[PDB]
Structure formats: C-alpha cells, structure tokens
Amino acid sequence: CGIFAYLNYHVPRTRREILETLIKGLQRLEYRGYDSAGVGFDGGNDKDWEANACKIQLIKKKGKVKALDEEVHKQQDMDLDIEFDVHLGIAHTRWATHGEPSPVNSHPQRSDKNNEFIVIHNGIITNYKDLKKFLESKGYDFESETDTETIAKLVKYMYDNRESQDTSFTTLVERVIQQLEGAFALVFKSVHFPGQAVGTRRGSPLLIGVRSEHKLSTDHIPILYRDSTTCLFPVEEKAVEYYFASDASAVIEHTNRVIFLEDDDVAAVVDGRLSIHRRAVQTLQMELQQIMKGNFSSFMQKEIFEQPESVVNTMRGRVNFDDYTVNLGGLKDHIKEIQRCRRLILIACGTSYHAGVATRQVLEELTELPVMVELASDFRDRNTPVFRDDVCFFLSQSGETADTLMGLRYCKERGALTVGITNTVGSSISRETDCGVHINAGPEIGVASTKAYTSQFVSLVMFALMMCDDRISMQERRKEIMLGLKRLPDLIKEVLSMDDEIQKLATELYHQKSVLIMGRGYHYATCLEGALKIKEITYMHSEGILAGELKHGPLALVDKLMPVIMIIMRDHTYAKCQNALQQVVARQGRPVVICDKEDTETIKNTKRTIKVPHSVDCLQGILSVIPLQLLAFHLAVLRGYDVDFPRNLAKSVTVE
Amino acid sequence: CGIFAYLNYHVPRTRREILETLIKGLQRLEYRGYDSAGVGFDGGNDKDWEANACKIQLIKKKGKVKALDEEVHKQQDMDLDIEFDVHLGIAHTRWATHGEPSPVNSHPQRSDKNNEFIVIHNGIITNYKDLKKFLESKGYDFESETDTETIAKLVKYMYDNRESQDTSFTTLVERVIQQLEGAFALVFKSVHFPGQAVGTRRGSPLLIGVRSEHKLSTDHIPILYRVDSTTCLFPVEEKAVEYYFASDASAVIEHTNRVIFLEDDDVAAVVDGRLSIHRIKDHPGRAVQTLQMELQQIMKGNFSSFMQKEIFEQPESVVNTMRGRVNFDDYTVNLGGLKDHIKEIQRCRRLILIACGTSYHAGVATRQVLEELTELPVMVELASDFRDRNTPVFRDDVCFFLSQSGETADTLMGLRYCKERGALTVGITNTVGSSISRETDCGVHINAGPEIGVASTKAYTSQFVSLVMFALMMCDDRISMQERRKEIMLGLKRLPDLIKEVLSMDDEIQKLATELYHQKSVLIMGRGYHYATCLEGALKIKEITYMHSEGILAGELKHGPLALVDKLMPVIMIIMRDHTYAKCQNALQQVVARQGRPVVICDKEDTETIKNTKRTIKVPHSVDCLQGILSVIPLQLLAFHLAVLRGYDVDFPRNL
Ligand SMILES: O=C[C@H](O)[C@@H](O)[C@H](O)[C@H](O)COP(=O)(O)O
Ligand SMILES: O=C[C@H](O)[C@@H](O)[C@H](O)[C@H](O)COP(=O)(O)O
Ligand SMILES: N[C@@H](CCC(=O)O)C(=O)O
C-alpha cells in the first residue's frame, strides 16, 4: 500500500496540475501495491477557489494506477481548468490481500455520503470490529468491508461530540488514534478544515516533503504536547508545497527536503505551516536516476544487469584488495562482542531467507559457530529458543517486513545481540537492531528481488571475512575469497553477455507447466531462489529440489516430459552432482545443466548447457543464480506477463 | 539384492523340500525389487546323498521368482525325491549393477565350468576391474560382465594356491575379502567343503538364523582370531540343526526367531554342523538374540497392497510404538532404550535431528514440541546437506538419527561424523541389527513392524510418536509442565481411535482423488505443526502418484509463491484448531481473493470454514502437537487412491 498527497499553499495549480501530481506520486509507489487506487480532491466549478473547498470528490477504480489515471480524465463533470491558490489532495494505491479490489474498498475512505472526512490508511487496525459496532449504534452506516472505514466514521464521531466550536483538526485525530489499535499511517482531509492535512503514524512509515523558493524558518521542528518559533514555513512569503508520502521515491522528484515522522507524531499543516504534536528537516541522499528504468524496458531487467555495479557498491569503502582487509563500519563497535557469542541465527522471509541459505556454509566455515537459518513466519509460530549469547541476523531488503520485524523484537526480549542486514536506511529493522549493515544496493523497484539478493550474499561474506581475520590458518582462504570478490563484477558481466542464449532456451520451456531445479551444497540456495523467481513472475510451477534428496522420493516425478534444470559446479560436491545427473538421465530426463566453462565432460554429454565462469566455491552461487534470474524474466515475456507487477502480490510484506 | 541359504545338518530333507525352502526364502525378499534370481544346490541322483556332494547344480534365470520356481520343477534329468541328511542350498535375487539382466549375469556366480565354487553377492566390488585383470593373467577366463564373478574366480585362486591340502574354507574366504574393495554380503559353497557354508559382510547386512530341537551350546558366539566345543555354536547332545543365512530377517522369521547379526569383516563358517565366527584383527562375541517379528507382519493379509495395509493398520502400529513405554494409569513415559543415557542427554545443550526424506519430515513435525518441552535449541538437518557443509558439532550436542531402515548412507555417515566430534548419538530406527541402531550410543526402536510398502506410512507416524514420547521424558521433572504432559498423554491415549475415525473417511478421500485424477499439480499449504504435513503429503503424492505436488509454507505465500494461485491450480490447505488458526484463516482469504478454490483439511467442528469452503476433509480434534498425525493420513490415502485410479502399482518401486 502507498500514500501520497499534494498540498500547494498559495502556489497556483490548476485542477489538472494537481491530479497529474497525485497520479505521478502513486506511480512512484505503485510497486508497493497495484490492485487498486484512488484520489481525493476538491470538487465544484467556481472561479473563486474559495467557494469550492466545501465539496470533496473521490475518484477510485480497480486495477493499477493507469486504470485510475484514465478514470480521472475524460470526465463530464470535473473542469480541469480551475486555478487553486490553496488546495489539498490525497491519493493511495492498495494491496488488496483480502476480498475483491473493488472501488468501494479502495482508499480514500469516507465518513458519510457528503465526504466530510476522507482518510488514506496504510496498515491494519486490530480492533476495527469493536469500533464498527460502536459506530453503528450511534447512527453511522458502514459501506465497505475494510478496516480503514472505521477510521473515517470515527474521526467524524469525535467531531460530532467536541466541546468547543473550534477544536483543532489535531485534537480530532488525536482522539481517533487513542481508539485505534495496531499499526497505521494516516493522512486526513476534511471540508471543515480546508487545506489542512493531518499526518500521524504508528508502526508504519510516513514522511512529509517540503519545497519553497524562500528560506525555511527552522530545520528542527520541536515536538509539542497538548507560534512563529514552532512551525516550519517560509519566512517572508507564503509559497510552499508539501508532500505527504509513505516512501521517499514519490517525493524525490519534487524535492529532497523531508521530515521523517516518528511513532505517535501527529503532524498538522495549518495556514501552510507544518507543526508536530504529541523531527529534523534533512536532505535525502537519493538521486532520481536511482528510481528510473534508464534505457531498460523494466525495473527488474535494469536491476539484474546492474548487479556488477550494485555488487561494487556493496563492497565500496569496506573491502581493500591491496592489503586484503575487510571493515564494515556498522559493526566496528560490536564485532568483538559478536565473536564471544556462541551461535548465529539468520531470520528472514523469501529471497532474503535464501540469502542465508546461500551463505550458511561459509559462515560455519569462517566463524566455526553453529549457524541456524529460519523462516521468520515459522520462527514465530514455534517460539524458537533464543539466548543472551545468540547473535541474531535479520535480512530484509525493505527493513519493514512484518514477520522479520516481529522476530527481531522476539529476540531482543530474550537478550540476544541483534544485527540488521537492510537495504533501507532508517527502516524499523535498521533502527531497532543493536548494529547492522546497509547493503547499499540502491532502491529496488522490481517486486522480485534480484540485486538485493546478491548484495545480501556479498554482505554476509564480508562479515564472515571479518570474523576470521585473526586466524593464521584461514589467511589463504580469506585471500582466495577476496580475490574472487575483486573479479566478481567482471564475471557477472560475462554471465549477462549470455542473455540471448538464456532467451533461446526460454523459448523451449515457456509452454511447460512445471520445472524442477536441482542442486546441492552452495547451490541449494540457488535452486530455491531460481524456483521462487520462476514462480513469482512467470507463474510456472517451478520447485527447487535438493539433489541429495532425489533418491528418497522426488526422483519418481522425473520422466522424459518433466523439464529439469541442474546445477553442477566445480566444487567439492561435483562427483555427487554428477551422480544426481546420472539418476535424472536414467529416468529419461533431458535436463538443462548450469555448469562451469571448463567442465568439458558435462558439456559434451549434455545438449543444453549454460556455461558460467568459475569463481570461488563460496561465491559461485552469485554467478549460478543470475542465469535463473534471466530465465525467469524471459519466460515471463514469452508468456505475456509483466516482470515488474506479478499477479496476486506486491513488494515488501509490511503487514501480516 | 536378496540373499538366502538353507543348511540342513542331520535334518533329513528331500531335494524338493530344499528347493521349496529356497524359493520361499526369495519370496520374502521380492519386495526389495529385482530383475533375476537363481539357486545353487547339489546335483546328481545317487540315492546315497553322500556321493552327490561333488556335483553342484545351478538354476539361474532372468525374471521373477515365480518363473524360477517353474524352471526348478521343469527338469527332466533331476530327481526331487533324493533325501539329503546334510545339504547346503543358496538362493539369490539380483538387482543388476554390473552386466545387464540375463541368466549368465545372474547369481550364484561360479568359479569354473565344473562349479567347484559358487557365491551369491549383495553389493558392488569397487576394484573388480583390477581383480579381473589379475585373474585373467593367471589363467582364469570370465564368462559374465558382473563384478561378482571375480569373487568366485578369486576364491578358487586361493584354493589353487593353498599351502596345505587341508586349509580351511574360512582361510580361503579371509584371503578373498582382504583383496576386495567396496560393499558386499557373501555366502560361499564349494564341492571341496561339502556341507559347509561361509558367510561374510562388509557394509551390507547378513544374519544367520538357527533352529534345533536340541539345546544349543551357547547364546553368545565368541570371536576367533588368527576351534573346539567351547568356541562355537552347535546342538549339545545330538547333531541335528538347521541354519538360515539371509540378508533380511523377513526370510528367516517363519522358520526361527533366533538370529545372529554379523558385523563388518566377520567370517562365519559352518563346519561339521557347528557355527563359528572368525576375525583377522571382556572378550568380544556375537549374541544369539530373539526377534519379536512374525510372518504375519510381512504379509498383505486381506489388503490388496502393502501400502493399503500399512496405512490402515496405523491404529495398531501407533499402539505398538507406545506399548510398554507409556503408562496412562499414572501419566509416566519410560523409553527403556534411553535409561542409561537420559541423565547425560538432559545435561546437553542442543538437539540435532539428522535424516533423509520422510524421516527428516518426522523431525520437522516434532521440532516445536521438542523445543517446548526440552527448552533446548532443536536443529533439523537433511543428512546429505549436513555432510556437504561440515556442520559444527560439539561434545555437548545430542544428535538423533531417524531411519526406518537404519542403513541409509547419508544418515549413517552423518552419525559417524558426529561420533568423531564427541556428540552423544541416539538412533530412532525400525530395524533390529541395523547399522544406525548399533553405532549410536543408545536408541529407540519405534516398533512399527516391518515396512514392506515402497513409501513410508506407519514408519512416519511411529517416528512422530517416538519423538513425542522422548520429549515427554525430557520434562518429567518440571512442575510447570505437568498439565501439558497430561494433555499430550491423554491425546496419545485417544490417538488410536482418532486414526480409525480418519480412516473411516476414506470414501471422502476417494471423491477428492477423482477430482484431482486429471490434475498435474497441487499445492499443499500449511504452517506450524502442519508444515511437515505439507512437505510429507507433497512427497507422498510425488513418489506414489507421479504428479507435481508441492508443500508451501503458508506464511511464505505473500513473499512470492502466491502468484501460482488462480481458478485452475488445485490447492489443499490445512487449518486446524491450534494457536495458528487465525493466521491460517488469513492464508485462506489470500488464496480465495486470487480466484483459488482450495480443499481444506480442518477440524470436524470448525463450522465456519466448512460452510465457506466447498470440499473439506473433516478430521477429529487432538492435542496441537499430535494433529500432524491425523492431518497427514488423508494425504497418505489421497496419494494411494490417485495412483490406483491411474493404473499404477503402489507396491512397485519405480525409483531405480
Ligand atoms: O522475490 C521475492 C521477494 O524478493 C520476496 O521473497 C521478499 O524477499 C520478501 O517478501 C521480503 O523481502 P525483504 O524483507 O528483504 O524486503
Ligand atoms: O516415502 C518416502 C521414503 O520412505 C523415503 O523418503 C525415506 O524416508 C528415506 O529414503 C529415508 O529412509 P530411512 O527412514 O530408512 O532412513
Ligand atoms: N553387483 C552385483 C550384485 C548386485 C546386487 O544384487 O546387489 C551384480 O550386479 O551382479
């Protein structure tokens, strides 16, 4: 789900300039949820913009944002020419995990048939059923099945029972959040408070961007508790443009000056002045180019072919190849205490969990500690034992995944040392961990993680290299690995140069219903992540099978018709991988083998081979997964699917 | 693959009776799979059995044992009425590895055209190439492509080059095995040692059954290192005795339940009707022990298949697993196999469960209750991956090895890995005498009865119960857990009848089987206590039905796999009444929202889901940590019925 609102205070914008700004903001957030969308602006057709703030218009439609962008336009009642000196517009894209993504269930919600209060919500209210029965008895009629409607029908209830004729919009919102349980990020708009917006959060992101050619009155808004030296506003004049949003990608295009709110911070823009109730106006360290497709037809394709660069960025300022030293600044004050601990636990979901499987072996090798890799959802169901001398890693590209974040607080309660491996600065997981590392792979827009996986991979390897930098016996092993990392970017380029060869094989498989991907050792993770990618964007039934497990049942599924992909690399499991290949062939399987270029034996005896360059055994997983990223991509194109917006989900599961 | 030899010593038997005994022995060994069988016995039709001991007749044939029996009685030049006071007959079922199936490549292999030496072999001789070259240079011509023939030719080489005219049959075999490499179980017969038998093994099971109406000299055979009445097994006051060599107790139990399990490099010899055990390496020996196995346990009975029998007898096998171990009269659990080690186990700091296939699923299915009741970390490992990674193991680790057969290579090698690192090892097995039950410090025999079916059915649920019972032992001193222990044990008390209740819904499962008859994929979704149910049910349907069933952790849906859901993909969901019930309902709403129409396995009294879901398999409620047994049985049956509908033989391996 995404939030975006545009408040232009004394900056004349026509009704078209505002709508094209709300739509453009949702496009920046569409990857967080594209099942439905909606906008909320002022209606009426009066030249004097003052006589129009009493009429709220809601345009909501099922589908992606492009379905809403067309619904907004070509309307017979809205005149897109009205100049507004002051105006507020709120927008929202929804990830409909439940029920149908109907316009009635999309946001902004309303509080009545006249739109006196409209709210956009990101999160879940854990007691909306109680709030629904209380509001129904007082005389409020509910229309939608969502939990957001109980927030709109309630802000009006606090308005219908106030004490003074002019209670601030903050007071109303403050009484609402006190009756709301769970997490939420809200942005209000009302006809009673024209131009005023109220943005409160609790367990969900919500920042406020600001732009103005004039000087700002301060850079540290003082949080208040229920004047000219308290609010953020232009000094001499009134020209200012605010940008409420749940992410920074929707605001960077307009300005890089935002104010990240905090839990229970009730921001309020009144008379064009931003004030917080119950901060720091800062510069974003992001360039627009980072969230642009460039010359690629899709974000996912860009993010795959940019892995040579993102790998370099992950190691930048951390790996020195002249003296073979590794230093992760985020762990300098804790590395000593980590080494005195007795166990590593890696906790994550989906592709981030695979990154742990991909590096478990080398972590065991170089730390000599037990390494346990856990799926966050299952980790929580079982109340896994955790102790004070456990070091718990939490791998999360977004840094907001629910099950991973709750697992973190579970481990903190038991006194464990917590470490965050994130791709998002200021995220919940990066803040609430004792320490952490920012993989610094750049923004990931494609729903299917690609560079985030390889960057997590490299990051966990760098940690392993630190944990053994005092072992004489492991010095040569460290050198081998670091020389591999030095050569890794160019080898990734070599893999990407086989893009057309991968595309050809894709034309041989796109019609199939299933594909089994088999590997072991360092490439168990490879066959799991490759199977997940193909599931996610192609919708083929791909499954990863541990090669050593074939003989124990799954091999019965292999015949001449069942597609099979095998991974056979020149590491210590080569002979065993060859035995698995022989078993597949005996069952009449005709598999595609991802192997090393020098593996002449495999290349001669196998028709379809993807020949990747050889790297260090504990790094080869990075090179062996990329062909499967590309394969998943091409298969999706052949089948007529979008690689950036796979069906039935969105990016980052921030609510469970 | 299957070995059987019958030695009647001063127990008169006709040639017919001997041949019928050999055939019957192989019939008990067919369930392992094979492609050819043969027998070796004394030829000649001289009415005096003593003059026929110099003519070894062979009858080998490609095909099933039934065809062999027809060839036996189809011999015009053979008189079946000759009575042998002393005679040795050997039989074999072959699973070809070296040399295609054929009469010549079948066992017994002979040393020359006169059959001076014959041998039956289970396994593979690795250095059979080098050995064949050597014997050919010495003037021995080979007639088969089997590695086994080198054994028959080599024993004649030692005989031909013996130093004295009276070198023992044992000495010859000792010199043969000292030149062999690989795995083998062997039974030798020769004209130069009439009436004598020599058995030896290395990495392959070989046991000896014994029967006599007279008292035996001992129940503990002492090892003889490189003779008289005080050193071997024999009937005391008279000569009559019968010996049964076999690679599987199933071929012996109908004649006797007193068996000797040989160990690696043992050379067991019967000379003058007396059994001695030799070795080349407080006094070691081999015990004559009693098996509680019965012939009825390895017979289909009234069932049409072993799979059907072993599924539907699970009420009885669960009861047998608990017999003598659970006392519902006073809420106590006592696994006798752990008496001398339960103290040390409770002082250890981590549990590691190591297994393959369905046995690994048994660990996943009990991980949570083990964590809960032991409060120790519990790590569940796939044996093949456990080996590849050189997983850290410590002296204070308790390592469990789950294995129905007790011989699975990766599981067995994992055991020896942990033993080297000083871990306390525990075997959870279902086969007496197996390697894993021997080499572990202690163990528990799940006592499910022999598993003859190709797929693990009762073994899985008996492993499940066995690990729950161990968990109940580990917390028997905790006041805070008394109630929980009582709840679990009253569930075990009621479990047999609840299984019967699930088996009474077989008709409902058949209806589901016809609905999936034409389907190529099915997703089985669950979490918590039923994660294992999803993985195990998915494996059964893969192994038995040959369709692409996959287990998906419900909590992982929104992280990618949910993209497979639509109106066409068959889905089975598990929703039981435990603490994850609300999260399972969430997963169901996520599937339905994407046009999925899943079949739900739920509690009988879950009225909400039964009304909102078309087809539901309604199982009875048990304790949360025991429901996995009830929820997996409908999936066992589903795989069974789908296979029958598609014309498959559920008792036929496939996995070759
Ligand atoms: O390709 C799949 C996605 O990348 C997905 O599996 C993702 O990994 C999780 O939904 C959470 O990821 P983060 O917690 O790292 O944001
Ligand atoms: O239906 C599944 C099979 O039974 C298979 O997965 C089996 O579990 C393994 O081959 C391990 O066998 P053991 O239990 O003998 O180690
Ligand atoms: N390797 C031997 C015996 C195989 C077996 O049956 O175990 C052969 O192929 O003849």
Numbering used by the authors:
A (entry chain B): 2 to 227, 242 to 293, 304 to 681
B (entry chain A): 2 to 227, 241 to 295, 300 to 674
What does the paper say about this structure?
GFAT is a modular enzyme composed of a glutaminase domain responsible for hydrolysis of l-Gln into l-glutamate (l-Glu) and an isomerase/transferase domain that catalyzes the isomerization of Frc6P to glucose-6-phosphate (Glc6P) as well as the transfer of ammonia to Glc6P to build glucosamine-6-phosphate (GlcN6P). The relative orientation of the two domains with their respective active sites is relevant for catalysis and affected by substrate binding. GFAT-1 activity is modulated by UDP-GlcNAc feedback inhibition and via phosphorylation by protein kinase A (PKA).
The well-conserved C-tail (C-terminal residues 670–681) is the major mobile element between the isomerase and glutaminase domain of GFAT. Miszkiel and Wojciechowski showed in molecular dynamic simulations that the C-tail lock mutation, which introduces a salt-bridge similar as observed in E. coli, limits the C-tail’s flexibility. We solved the crystal structure (resolution 2.38 Å) and confirmed that the L405R substitution indeed formed a salt-bridge with the C-terminal Glu681 and additionally interacted with Asp428. The kinetics (l-Gln and Frc6P) and the UDP-GlcNAc inhibition remained unaffected by the C-tail lock mutation. Importantly, the L405R mutant clearly showed a single melting point at 56.9 ± 0.1 °C in thermal shift assays, indicating a changed stability of both domains, which can only be explained by the altered interactions between them.
